[PDB]
C-alpha cells in the first residue's frame, strides 16, 4: 500500500509501521491534516519520520501516506514572479486561496498552478519517430514579455517521439509529448520534478571568462566577478547590502535572478518582499518589472527548520533549471549564517557529535558542495547552448570575527570578497566597499577579455591599486611629518588618491548620470586620472632633480580648471550623452591636460 500507520509520537519524531518499501529520505504526509516529514531511519517494516510541522494532536493509528520521492522542486512555467519558501510552498497562492494571514498546518497547494493555461509552440522539425535525449528543447512557452520558457526533455529520459502536441493553449497537467524506448512509453507535461540535493547534469563544465558587470565603478574595475563566479559579502546591519542586490537585479548582464532568504528576521523579510516588486528596468525603450525575470525564496525565523536548511538547495535547483535553457543566472543568498544555524539545530535534533563550535562534522563539505554548483556550462541536449549560475552568499561573522566556522569555510571557498563596511557608510562613502580588505581572484581569467575589448585597462587597474595602497602607507608618515614637509611626489600621490577616492570609487546611485556606469565610462574616467598623475609626477621628477622645482602647489595653481574637469567626469550621463560623445569629451580632457603640462614645462 501507499499508506503506513503512526505507531508513536515523541516531539517532532513520528514512528510508523507497514512502511516496508519506503526508502531513506522519502517525504511522507502524516495524519488526517497531512503534515509533511521525511524518513530518517528504517528498521524491519517500520520507519522513523522527522516531521517538519507541529505534531500536536497526531494519534496512534493515523495514516502515513508515502510520496515515492525525496525533497524536490516542480520545474515548469509559473516560476517567474513567484514567492516560495525553502520547501517550495507558494506563499502568494496560499494567501490568495486561504484568505488568511497565517500558513495552515499540512497545506498541500502545488508549487506551479495547474489552472493557468500556457501558449505553447513545438520545435517545428520534431516529428513522430524523431530521436530525442535528456536536455532537448521540444517547445517554448511565452511566459511573459521577457522570458521565453524552454520546455526540455528531463535528464535520465530518452527515446523516439510517439506524440507531440500542436501549437495551442495548455494546462501544466496536459500531456504535450510522448516518447518510447525499448517498447516502454513515457508521457510528459510542461512540469518536470527534480531532487534538490542532486546536481543537475551538463555536457561540460567550463572556465569562467566573461565579467558579471554591476554598473558600479568599484566592483566592476577593482574587484570584478565573472559569470559563473562565486562571491561573499558581509551580512550586517549598517553596511548597506542593498546596493549589491539591486545592482544585480536592475543592471547586471544576468538573464534571470534567484533570491533566497534562508531564516531572516520577519521585518527584514517583509522589507525585501515589499521592495522587490517596486524595482523596474528599461528593456527595448520600455520600462518593465524586475518580477518578470526574478523568483524569490523567503523564510522567516519561525518557518520549519527543514525549510530554512532546504532553502539554498531549492534556490540553486531553480538556478540550474534556467542555466539549462542557456540563460545566465545570478543567485543571492541573504545570509548563509542563518542556513548554517538551521543545519546545526537539525544535527542537534539528530543528537550528532558537536565537532567545531557545535556545528556538524559535514558543515565545510556541505558549503563546498553547494558552491561547486556555480559555473559556466555546455548544456545537456541537442540545440547547442551555454548557460551559467553565479552565486553571491552573504555571511555574518559575530562581532566581525572572521575565524567563525561558516565565515572561515566561506572565504576559504569563494573567489571574490566584496567587503562592505559600516565605517564607510558612516562617512557617507557610498557604495561602502572597503578597497583594503576586498579582493578578486578572477583577474587572470578576465585578462583575455580585457585584452580583446579594452586593452589599456589592466595597467590602469594596477596603477590605481598602487596609488590607493601608497596613501595607506603615507598616512602614518604624515601623522609625524605634518603634511607640509612631505616630498612633492607623495603630495601628488595623496591628492590623486583623494581624486580617485572621492570621484571614481564613490557613486551616488540616486542620481540619473550614476545609477549605472558602463565599462567604457569606467575605463575613460580612470584613464584620465592616471594620465594626469603620470604627467604631474613627470613634471616634478624632471625639474626637482636639479632645476627650479615644480611643486604640487604650482600644479594646482596652474591646473585648477583641469582638476575641476577631472572631478566633473562622473556627471556625464550614458543615456543623454552617447558613447562616442562621452569618449570625445574624455579625449578633450587628455588634450587639455597635455597642453596645460606642456605650458608648465
Amino acid at each position: 500500500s501507499t499508506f503506513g500507520y503512526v505507531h508513536g509520537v515523541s516531539g517532532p519524531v513520528v514512528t510508523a509501521c507497514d512502511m516496508a518499501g519506503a526508502a531513506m529520505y522519502e517525504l511522507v504526509r502524516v495524519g488526517h491534516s497531512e503534515l509533511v516529514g521525511e524518513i530518517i531511519r528504517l528498521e524491519g517494516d517500520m520507519a522513523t519520520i522527522q516531521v517538519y510541522e507541529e505534531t500536536s494532536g497526531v494519534s496512534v493509528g493515523d495514516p502515513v501516506l508515502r510520496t515515492g520521492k525525496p525533497l524536490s522542486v516542480e520545474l515548469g512555467p509559473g516560476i517567474m514572479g513567484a514567492i516560495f519558501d525553502g520547501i517550495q510552498r507558494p506563499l502568494s497562492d496560499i494567501s490568495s486561496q486561504t484568505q488568511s494571514i497565517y500558513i495552515p498546518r499540512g497545506v498541500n497547494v502545488s508549487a506551479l498552478s495547474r489552472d493557468i493555461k500556457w501558449e505553447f509552440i513545438p520545435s517545428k522539425n520534431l516529428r513522430v519517430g524523431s530521436h530525442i535525449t535528456g536536455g532537448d528543447i521540444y517547445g517554448i512557452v511565452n511566459e511573459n514579455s521577457l522570458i521565453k520558457h524552454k520546455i526540455m526533455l528531463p535528464p535520465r529520459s530518452r527515446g523516439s517521439v510517439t506524440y507531440i502536441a500542436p501549437p495551442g493553449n495548455y494546462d501544466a497537467s496536459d500531456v504535450v509529448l510522448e516518447l518510447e524506448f525499448e517498447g516502454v512509453k513515457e508521457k510528459l507535461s510542461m512540469v518536470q520534478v527534480w531532487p534538490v540535493r542532486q546536481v543537475r547534469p551538463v555536457t561540460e563544465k567550463l572556465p569562467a571568462n566573461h565579467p558579471l558587470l554591476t554598473g558600479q565603478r568599484v566592483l566592476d574595475a577593482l574587484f570584478p566577478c565573472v559569470q559563473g563566479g562565486t562571491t561573499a559579502i558581509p551580512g550586517a546591519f549598517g553596511c548597506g547590502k542593498t546596493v549589491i542586490s539591486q545592482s544585480l537585479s536592475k543592471y547586471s548582464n544576468s538573464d534571470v535572478i534567484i533570491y533566497v532568504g534562508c531564516g531572516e528576521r520577519g521585518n527584514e523579510m517583509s522589507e525585501v518582499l515589499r521592495d522587490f516588486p517596486e524595482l523596474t528596468m528599461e528593456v527595448d525603450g520600455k520600462v518593465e518589472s524586475i518580477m518578470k525575470r526574478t523568483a524569490l525564496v523567503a523564510n522567516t525565523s519561525n518557518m520549519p527548520v527543514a525549510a530554512r536548511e532546504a532553502s539554498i538547495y531549492t534556490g540553486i535547483t531553480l538556478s540550474e533549471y534556467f542555466r539549462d535553457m542557456g540563460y545566465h543566472v545570478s543567485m543571492m543568498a541573504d545570509s548563509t549564517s542563518r542556513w548554517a544555524e538551521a543545519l546545526r539545530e537539525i544535527s542537534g535534533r539528530l543528537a550528532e557529535m558537536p565537532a567545531d563550535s557545535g556545528y556538524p562534522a559535514y558543515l565545510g563539505a556541505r558549503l563546498a558542495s553547494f558552491y561547486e554548483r556555480a559555473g559556466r556550462v555546455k548544456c545537456l541536449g541537442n540545440p547547442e547552448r551555454e548557460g551559467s549560475v553565479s552565486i553571491v552568499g552573504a555571511v555574518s561573522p559575530p562581532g566581525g570575527d572572521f575565524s567563525d566556522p561558516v565565515t572561515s569555510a566561506t572565504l576559504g571557498i569563494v573567489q571574490v570578497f566584496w567587503g562592505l563596511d559600516k565605517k564607510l557608510a558612516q562617512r557617507k562613502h557610498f557604495p561602502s566597499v572597503n578597497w583594503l580588505i576586498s579582493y578578486s581572484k578572477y583577474m587572470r581569467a578576465l585578462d583575455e577579455y580585457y585584452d580583446k575589448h579594452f586593452t589599456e585597462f589592466v595597467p590602469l587597474r594596477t596603477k590605481a591599486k598602487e596609488i590607493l595602497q601608497e596613501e595607506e602607507d603615507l598616512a602614518e608618515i604624515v601623522q609625524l611629518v605634518g603634511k607640509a614637509s612631505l616630498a612633492e611626489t607623495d603630495k601628488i600621490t595623496l591628492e590623486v588618491a583623494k581624486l580617485i577616492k572621492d570621484d571614481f570609487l564613490q557613486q551616488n546611485g540616486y542620481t540619473p548620470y550614476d545609477r549605472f556606469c558602463p565599462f567604457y565610462k569606467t575605463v575613460g574616467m580612470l584613464s584620465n586620472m592616471i594620465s594626469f598623475y603620470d604627467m604631474a609626477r613627470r613634471a616634478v621628477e624632471t625639474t626637482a632633480q636639479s632645476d627650479n622645482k615644480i611643486t604640487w602647489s604650482i600644479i594646482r595653481e596652474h591646473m585648477g580648471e583641469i582638476l575641476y574637469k577631472l572631478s566633473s567626469m562622473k556627471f556625464k550621463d550614458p543615456v543623454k550623452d552617447g558613447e562616442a560623445k562621452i569618449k570625445a569629451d574624455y579625449a578633450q580632457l587628455l588634450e587639455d591636460m597635455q597642453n596645460a603640462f606642456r605650458s608648465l614645462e
Binding site: 488526517h32 494519534s59 493509528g61
Partner: protein, 57 residues
Amino acid sequence: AAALGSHGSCSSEVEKETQEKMTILQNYFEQNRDEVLDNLLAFVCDIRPEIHENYRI
C-alpha cells in the same frame, strides 16, 4: 479641588451606567434563552454513535 469637585458628583453616572448595562443583559437574555435552550437540548438528545476514525478490522 477645582479639578476634582464637579466630576466627583458626575461619577454617580458609573452606577447609572452599571444599572443600564445590567438592564440590557436582562432584556437580551429573556428574549433569547428559549432558542438557546431548544438548540442546547436538541444537541444533547441527538446522540449518533460512531467508532474512532483510526479503527481497522
